[PDB]
C-alpha cells in the first residue's frame, strides 16, 4: 500500500518530467514507404505509398491508468503499470504520396490512434535500484485514417486505410517504443 | 464526415439505452471456483478458491474511444468501434474463500480492471439491414487485486492475485461478453 503509493509517485513524477522536457509532443517519426496490393470485387489496386513529415501529437496527456499491480516476490517487489492518454486520442499527422498506375497524387492525413497504452514493468529489490524491466506500446485496437480529400466510399480508401493501419501497428508502434522506453527508463532508474 | 457521425450517433444512442438497462451496472457474475497450482520457486502452491456475490461496477460510464473506423467495401459500409469507460475503472467486488493446506480463510476483495474496452464491428448495406458482425471484450491489460486482510508482500498474495487475474481473463471476460454482446446486438440491429 505504501509501496503502491510510492511506485505510483515514481511513475507520475517520471511522466511529469517527460512531459516537461517537451521532446515527446510533438514526436517526430521517420519517413516510411510501403507497397500495397489488393483485389476488391473485379477491381485491382496495386501500388506504392510514402509517408513524410510524420508527427505524433497528444502524448502530453499521458497519465497512469490506475494503481500499480504489485506483488512482493521473495524479497523483491514486482510492479506492472499502464500509462495511457487522457483528454485525447494520440494524433498522427503526415503527408501522403501514393502511386496507382499513372496516378500519383499527394495529400495530407490525420490518423487517430485510439486508447494508446504503454505497459511497463518495474523491479525493486529490498535495496534498491528501481529497475524498469519491460516497456511496450500495446497493440492499437482502432486506428482511424482521415485521408485528405478521399471519400471513405471510394474503393481505394479502404485499401489505403488498411495499409496505413498495418504500418502504424508495426513500424510506427515500434518506433514510438524506441523513443519512449529510454525516456521513462532514465527517469525511473534515476 | 456524415456517415461516420451517423455511426457514432447510433453507437452513442445504444450505449445510453444499454446503460439504463440494469443487470449492466452493477452486473452480476456467476459464482466461480478454481483448483489452482502455481510454482513460484522452491515453494509450490496447490489449493482451491471460490468467488461468490461477484458484482461488476462502472459500465454506466461506457463511452466511445473516438470515431468509428469506417470504409466502404463492395457496396457495404463497414465500421469498427472501440468503447471503453470514461472517468471510472471497471471494479469487481466479491467474497473470496480459499484453501491451501488446512489454511482456509475467507475475505472480501476489490479487483480493478484497468482500461476496460469493448471492440465491435458493424456492416451496413444500402440494401439492407445493419448487422453487428463482431463483438469482443478485449484482454484486460492490467488487473489490480485488493484482497482483504492480505499483504502484497505476503507470498500467498502473489499466487492468489495471479490466479484471480487468469480467472478474470478467462471466465469473467466470457461472462461479461455474455451480457454485453446480445445487448448491443439488439440495440444496433433495430
| Resolution rounded to one decimal, in angstroms | 2.0
Closest CA to B3 of A152, A68, A73: A152
What is A44-83 written as a DSSP string?
EEEEEEEEEEEEEE-GGGEEE-SS-EEEE-SSEEEEEEEE
Q: CA-to-CA distance for A98 and A105, rounded, in angstroms?
A: 6
Cα distances from B86 to residues A34, A174, A190, B48, B125, in angstroms, run 36, 27, 33, 35, 31
**Contact criterion met (CB below 8 Å) for A146 and A168:** no
Q: How far apart are the first and last CA of chain B?
A: 23
What are the counts of helices (DSSP H) followed by strands (DSSP E) for chain B?
Answer: 3, 11
Which chain B residues contact residue A1 at CB under 8 A? 152
Summarize chain B as % helix, strand, coil (round to 5): 30, 45, 25
Is the CB of B71 less than 8 angstroms away from the CB of A114?
Answer: no
Adjacent-strand bridge partners of B105: none
* B146: exposed, middle or buried (Cβ count in 10 Å: 0-12, 13-18, 19+): middle
Three cell numbers at B176?
461479461
Tell me phi and psi for residue B40, to 5 degrees: -100, -55
A39, A142, A143, A164: which to substitute to probe chain B, counting the most B Cβ within 10 Å? A142
**Contact criterion met (CB below 8 Å) for B113 and B148:** no
Experimental approach was X-ray
Answer whether the bond into residue B59 is a cis peptide, omega within 30°.
no
Q: CA-to-CA distance for B182 and B28, rounded, in angstroms?
A: 16
Q: CA-to-CA distance for A129 and A126, rounded, in angstroms?
A: 9
Q: CA-to-CA distance for B153 and A78, rounded, in angstroms?
A: 10
The answer regarding whether domain B1-190 maps to CATH 3.30.1130.10 reads no
What is B71-130 written as a DSSP string?
EEETTEEEEEEEEEESSS-EEEEEEEEEEBTTB--EEEEEEEEET-EEEEEEEEESSS--
B114, B124, B145: which to substitute to probe chain A, counting the most A Cβ within 10 Å? B114
Instruction: Give the containing element (helix H, strand E) for B181.
Output: helix B173-189
Closest CA to A82 of B63, B165, B141: B141
Q: CA-to-CA distance for A179 and A86, rounded, in angstroms?
A: 20
Domain ranges of chain A: 1-190
B4 Ramachandran zone, left/alpha/beta (phi>0; psi -120 to 50): alpha
* A26: exposed, middle or buried (Cβ count in 10 Å: 0-12, 13-18, 19+): middle
* A51: exposed, middle or buried (Cβ count in 10 Å: 0-12, 13-18, 19+): buried
Adjacent-strand bridge partners of B99: B48
Q: CA-to-CA distance for A71 and B153, rounded, in angstroms?
A: 6
Residues 6+ apart with CB under 8 A from B1: A152, B70
* A34: exposed, middle or buried (Cβ count in 10 Å: 0-12, 13-18, 19+): middle
Q: Which residue of B has its CA nearest to A38?
A: B73
**Contact criterion met (CB below 8 Å) for B54 and A128:** no
Amino acid at each position: 500500500d505504501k509501496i503502491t503509493e510510492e511506485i505510483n509517485k515514481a511513475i507520475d513524477d517520471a511522466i511529469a518530467a517527460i512531459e516537461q522536457s517537451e521532446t515527446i509532443d510533438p514526436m517526430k517519426v521517420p519517413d516510411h514507404a510501403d507497397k500495397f496490393e489488393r483485389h476488391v470485387g473485379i477491381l485491382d489496386f496495386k501500388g506504392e505509398l510514402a509517408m513524410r513529415n510524420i508527427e505524433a501529437r497528444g502524448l502530453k496527456q499521458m497519465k497512469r491508468q490506475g494503481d500499480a499491480n504489485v506483488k512482493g516476490e521473495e524479497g523483491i517487489v514486482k510492479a506492472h503499470l499502464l500509462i495511457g492518454v487522457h483528454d485525447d486520442i494520440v494524433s498522427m499527422e503526415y503527408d501522403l504520396a501514393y502511386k496507382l498506375g499513372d496516378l500519383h497524387p499527394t495529400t495530407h492525413v490525420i490518423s487517430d490512434i485510439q486508447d494508446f497504452v504503454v505497459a511497463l514493468s518495474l523491479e525493486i529489490p529490498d535495496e534498491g535500484n528501481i529497475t524498469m524491466t519491460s516497456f511496450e506500446v500495446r497493440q492499437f485496437a482502432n486506428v482511424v485514417n482521415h485521408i485528405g480529400g478521399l471519400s471513405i466510399l471510394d474503393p481505394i480508401f479502404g485499401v489505403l486505410s488498411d495499409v496505413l493501419t498495418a504500418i502504424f501497428q508495426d513500424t510506427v508502434r515500434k518506433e514510438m517504443t524506441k523513443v519512449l522506453a529510454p525516456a521513462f527508463k532514465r527517469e525511473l532508474e534515476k
